[PDB]
Amino acid sequence: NIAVAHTDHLSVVYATMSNFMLNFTNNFSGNHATFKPDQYVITSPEGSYKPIIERQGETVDGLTIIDTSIVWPILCQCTYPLVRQSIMEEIVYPDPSTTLSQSLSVAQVLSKLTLPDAFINMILSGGDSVVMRTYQTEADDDLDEGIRMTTYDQYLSHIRERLHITNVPDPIYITGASTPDQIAASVQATHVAVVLYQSGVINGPASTYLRENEVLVVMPDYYDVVSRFANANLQMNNNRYHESVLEIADIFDQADFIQTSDAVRQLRALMPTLSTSQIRHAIERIAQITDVDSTDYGKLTLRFLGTLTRSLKMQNAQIRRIRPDGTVLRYDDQIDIEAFRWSRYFLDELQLRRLSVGLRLITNPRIARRFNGVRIMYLTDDDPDPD
Amino acid sequence: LAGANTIIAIMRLFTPQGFLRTDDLAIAANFPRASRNPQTYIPYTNQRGTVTNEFASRFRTIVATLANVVNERAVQDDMQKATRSCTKQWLRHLETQFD
Amino acid sequence: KRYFPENLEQNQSAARLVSAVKARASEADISSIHLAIAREVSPMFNVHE
Amino acid sequence: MLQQPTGGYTTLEQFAFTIRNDGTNATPTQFLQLLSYEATENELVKKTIPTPETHLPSARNVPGNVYIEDAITQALFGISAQNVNAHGYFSRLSALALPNTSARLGLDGVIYNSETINIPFYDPAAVANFAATYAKLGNASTPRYRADMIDIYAHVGLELAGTDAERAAGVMPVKRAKFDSWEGSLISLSRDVVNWKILAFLIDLCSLEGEALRAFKTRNRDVFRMMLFIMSTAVAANVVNRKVTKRVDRVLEYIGVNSMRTAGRTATITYDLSRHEFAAKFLQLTFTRWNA
Amino acid sequence: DKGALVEADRVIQRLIPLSSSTYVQRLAAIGALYPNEFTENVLDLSRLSTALLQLSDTYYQHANDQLRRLYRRMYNDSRTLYMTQRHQELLLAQITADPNILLYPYTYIFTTIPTSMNYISNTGQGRIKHSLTVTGATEHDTVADIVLGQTGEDVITISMVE
Numbered sequence A: 001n002i003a004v005a006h007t008d009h010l011s012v013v014y015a016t017m018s019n020f021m022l023n024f025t026n027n028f029s030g031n032h033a034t035f036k037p038d039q040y041v042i043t044s045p046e047g048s049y050k051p052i053i054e055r056q057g058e059t060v061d062g063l064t065i066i067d068t069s070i071v072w073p074i075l076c077q078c079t080y081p082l083v084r085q086s087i088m089e090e091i092v093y094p095d096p097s098t099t100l101s102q103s104l105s106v107a108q109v110l111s112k113l114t115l116p117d118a119f120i121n122m123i124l125s126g127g128d129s130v131v132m133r134t135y136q137t138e139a140d141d142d143l144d145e146g147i148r149m150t151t152y153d154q155y156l157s158h159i160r161e162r163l164h165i166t167n168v169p170d171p172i173y174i175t176g177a178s179t180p181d182q183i184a185a186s187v188q189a190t191h192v193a194v195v196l197y198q199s200g201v202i203n204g205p206a207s208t209y210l211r212e213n214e215v216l217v218v219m220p221d222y223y224d225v226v227s228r229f230a231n232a233n234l235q236m237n238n239n240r241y242h243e244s245v246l247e248i249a250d251i252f253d254q255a256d257f258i259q260t261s262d263a264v265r266q267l268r269a270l271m272p273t274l275s276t277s278q279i280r281h282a283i284e285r286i287a288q289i290t291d292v293d294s295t296d297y298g299k300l301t302l303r304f305l306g307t308l309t310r311s312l313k314m315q316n317a318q319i320r321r322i323r324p325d326g327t328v329l330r331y332d333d334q335i336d337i338e339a340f341r342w343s344r345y346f347l348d349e350l351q352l353r354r355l356s357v358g359l360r361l362i363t364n365p366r367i368a369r370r371f372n373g374v375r376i377m378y379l380t381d382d383d384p385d386p387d
Numbered sequence B: 001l002a003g004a005n006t007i008i009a010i011m012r013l014f015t016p017q018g019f020l021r022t023d024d025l026a027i028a029a030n031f032p033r034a035s036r037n038p039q040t041y042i043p044y045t046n047q048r049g050t051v052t053n054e055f056a057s058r059f060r061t062i063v064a065t066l067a068n069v070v071n072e073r074a075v076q077d078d079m080q081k082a083t084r085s086c087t088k089q090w091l092r093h094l095e096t097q098f099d
Numbered sequence C: 001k002r003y004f005p006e007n008l009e010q011n012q013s014a015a016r017l018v019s020a021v022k023a024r025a026s027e028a029d030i031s032s033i034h035l036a037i038a039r040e041v042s043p044m045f046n047v048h049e
Numbered sequence D: 001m002l003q004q005p006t007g008g009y010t011t012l013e014q015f016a017f018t019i020r021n022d023g024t025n026a027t028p029t030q031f032l033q034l035l036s037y038e039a040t041e042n043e044l045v046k047k048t049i050p051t052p053e054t055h056l057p058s059a060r061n062v063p064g065n066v067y068i069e070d071a072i073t074q075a076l077f078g079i080s081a082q083n084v085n086a087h088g089y090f091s092r093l094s095a096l097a098l099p100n101t102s103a104r105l106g107l108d109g110v111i112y113n114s115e116t117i118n119i120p121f122y123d124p125a126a127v128a129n130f131a132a133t134y135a136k137l138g139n140a141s142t143p144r145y146r147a148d149m150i151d152i153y154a155h156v157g158l159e160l161a162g163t164d165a166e167r168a169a170g171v172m173p174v175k176r177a178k179f180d181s182w183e184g185s186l187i188s189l190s191r192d193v194v195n196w197k198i199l200a201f202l203i204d205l206c207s208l209e210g211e212a213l214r215a216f217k218t219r220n221r222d223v224f225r226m227m228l229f230i231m232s233t234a235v236a237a238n239v240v241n242r243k244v245t246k247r248v249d250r251v252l253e254y255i256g257v258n259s260m261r262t263a264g265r266t267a268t269i270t271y272d273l274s275r276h277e278f279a280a281k282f283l284q285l286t287f288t289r290w291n292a
Numbered sequence E: 001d002k003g004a005l006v007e008a009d010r011v012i013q014r015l016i017p018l019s020s021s022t023y024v025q026r027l028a029a030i031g032a033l034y035p036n037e038f039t040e041n042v043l044d045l046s047r048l049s050t051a052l053l054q055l056s057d058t059y060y061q062h063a064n065d066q067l068r069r070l071y072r073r074m075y076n077d078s079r080t081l082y083m084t085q086r087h088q089e090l091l092l093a094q095i096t097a098d099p100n101i102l103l104y105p106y107t108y109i110f111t112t113i114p115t116s117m118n119y120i121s122n123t124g125q126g127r128i129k130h131s132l133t134v135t136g137a138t139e140h141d142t143v144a145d146i147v148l149g150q151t152g153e154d155v156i157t158i159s160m161v162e
Helices: A001-017 A068-076 A097-124 A152-166 A182-191 A204-212 A262-270 A276-292 A296-303 A349-361 B003-014 B022-029 B055-071 B080-097 C014-026 C030-038 D028-032 D066-078 D089-097 D124-139 D153-162 D165-167 D187-196 D198-207 D212-220 D221-235 D272-290 E022-031 E045-061 E065-074 E085-097
Strands: A039-043 A127-135 A147-151 A194-197 A216-219 A243-247 A318-321 B020-021 B039-040 D019-021 D025-026 D043-045 D110-111 D171-173 D176-180 D238-242 D248-253 E081-084 E109-110
Touching: A039 A147, A039 D272, A068 C030, A097 A262, A097 A276, A097 A296, A127 A152, A152 A194, A152 A216, A182 A194, A182 A204, A194 D124, A204 E022, A262 A349, B003 B055, B039 D212, B055 C030, B080 C014, C014 D089, D019 D187, D025 D028, D028 D171, D028 D221, D043 D153, D066 D089, D066 D110, D066 D187, D066 D198, D066 D272, D089 D110, D110 D238, D124 D272, D153 D165, D153 D221, D153 D272, D165 D171, D176 D221, D187 D221, D187 D238, D198 E045, D212 D221, D212 E045, D221 D272, E022 E045, E022 E065, E085 E109
Parallel strands: A147 A216, A194 A216, E081 E109
Antiparallel strands: A039 A318, A127 A147, A127 A243, B020 B039, D019 D025, D043 D171, D176 D248, D238 D248
16 A cells, blocks of 8 residues: 555655755665665874764664664554545655755854864864984085984874875885985875885985985984994994974975975964864964854854864874775875875865965064064163154 | 784784883982982873874774774674674764763 | 763663773862872882782 | 967967966966976877767857957866856857958957957958867857767877887877976966966967978977866876975876866866866867868 | 787777776786786686786786786776787777767877786696706795695595506
């Protein structure tokens, strides 16, 4: 009796609902034997990735507990318009506008929600930094000068995941058979002046390459660094180096991965040393300053989403599939959508476009009316002039 | 050790993250001291970066190691399978708490 | 106490891990904490256990 | 009516194509000097370009004066342009294709429906010669007439990166263009080039013949190459920067290979699918004309 | 290659991966190399994929640097159909006969066929019984000792007397 109402009526409801704007995922291929959902996560190179799908213990007001017994009313006690016996009740075709506009209400609520966090993380994207000893190799090297190097731990903790995100071959190990030509080919392959050290001892032309080109060698440890290089100068010495920070912006320079505008750079140069609680406070302030009311549906949705704890670390975050095994896969043209290759700091294209103009505004000399340092000097002030 | 790499690796999680200070003010003050050259291990140096904090980053690698450890762990009972999935989230919470 | 991520404490399948964490997670005292901090620097005489 | 010189309209200083760079108005050639390359193992081989369809799309009855220069240059290099074919006004160029038409193509790049006062325009003969080919931009989108979006780019590679030897051979390694750069370099370049009065370049490309045309091609190779450059950045799979001892080198991988990317990115202008079709069509026509 | 007339539906029976996983790209790459020697033995088709993958993994594993790079090129430009000059000659013929025929357009002709060693590739049952030659083109010098693993009784047993 009901079968016509299902196959010939309800199916179309499903077929429209598949095209609703927010029904964005693939749910089921129709083959129970081999279907696993594609699993995206929002991976920051710093903190742990956050899967979109998981057993996170939210019941969503009990919605995730599935009661199968609902089928009994569906057969044995529910009217359908198609099953007449025959009243011929007219079919209802609901206005698109209601579900549509509530979908849009959700979307705009979410973008406006994320905005302050996304903006701040755009600024700080260069700010992650690694400890870097710079051993000197010349008779009159300045403290900045020499061969930059970092421990392998700092490499894994920052540089590697970022290389995974930029989708490049991993940097070559250098073995002391390494030609400067090979180090060059490696760097132009990965676009980052970096090589993993492997075994000693690095030869002179390679050393002059690494020095002249500011390439960052990556030692397993600092146990006997000068032994690792064949230094003809004998200028290199295990005690002769200078430890210093090295911003990720001083390494990576990708357009929608790491904001490396000199404006944003000097803006960060102005910043006090920051903890994550401070950054969170900055975001919470911008949100305080720019909160703008919702539309009643957006108030209902913000209320429904609950308190926005936002524990997830969005610093340099990206959208990437995990393997079911639990590893994070690299982006794949041939499977992941183009929209996922770069977060673009999670800002709209018009925002980035206006943003570049803003950066021109924020470095104009005329605006720079915060002045640094004063001369004290006892002196008569006939004919004053501020300049 | 040739066959026990995961154990040595988990054991590296315990390595202290600080540095070995000399007790210089105590030596200038001529304070009593049993050691020939007085020293002390500070558990952690102050954050020399502007955003990155090396302690918190170390705990990120530790907890990531530990989570991939729990993930690799075989279980028999269903309930163990559930707790195994839950501890990973717990670890993530910790890591944010430490940061 | 910020022991568990939100929801996970009340989650039914978390119950073992929760009972695990609760087994270890002792209540704070200024005295025990300051002691824990102080003994990193204080000389030890009777060997610790 | 502006008389065409014995050289093209391009000889006139009024039409000079120059991108801003190093604080001056650099000619495209002096910018192309900064370009440098990294050949990869992969190879581009130029297949013969299909002959463009004979069909000229109808310039449907349009009361207004279409701004065609703006439409083409924005379709090819414009930062924000989208859905370039649904309005489909490129067809209008065919109005100029007729002998003794009342329409004129002004130096503003507007297709006036009739001759109008105080609006200087290209010689109708030459515009007929140009429209005879470029009205086919109008059928960029019609399924029967779409141009290849993949193989045509090899020609772009060969005409840009390609050394005289590679161009003789017809095959070149897939290269990776790079130049020392200021912030937002590709964007400013794409606008400086969007501002060009390219219709001069095209009308001369299509109306000149013999030694005049050959002189035109040698004189303007760098202009063509620059348009090719903005386009190649619109299709390049990615555009990284490299630190190079207190200098930054912009790096587009790769020249001559359409990634077919339609996702926006800050570094360069992006082709929506319609722009890809339009550009492929434009490349078909311009390259077919560039070889005669 | 043996010159036989062939009534085949199409000159190249290999698929072109318009979009795919990497394993298929390496399959399509090894496929146009035509590594296999001619063979009349019945194959166990059920495991074919594995075989063809392992072959690929070894072909790249012991090929001279230029052939290696050729393999990589085919592996990245997987959308292209690599084909021998004679294939393309046949396509030219079948186009001239039927101008309206549709053929895959992105193709790359080998100006020169790769000169790799042909691989024996019987995948049916039977131990090989090699008779080793005393000497050969390879000149070994101070080769490292090759340990042989122990075998189960399930694989092979060693009774005292035939």
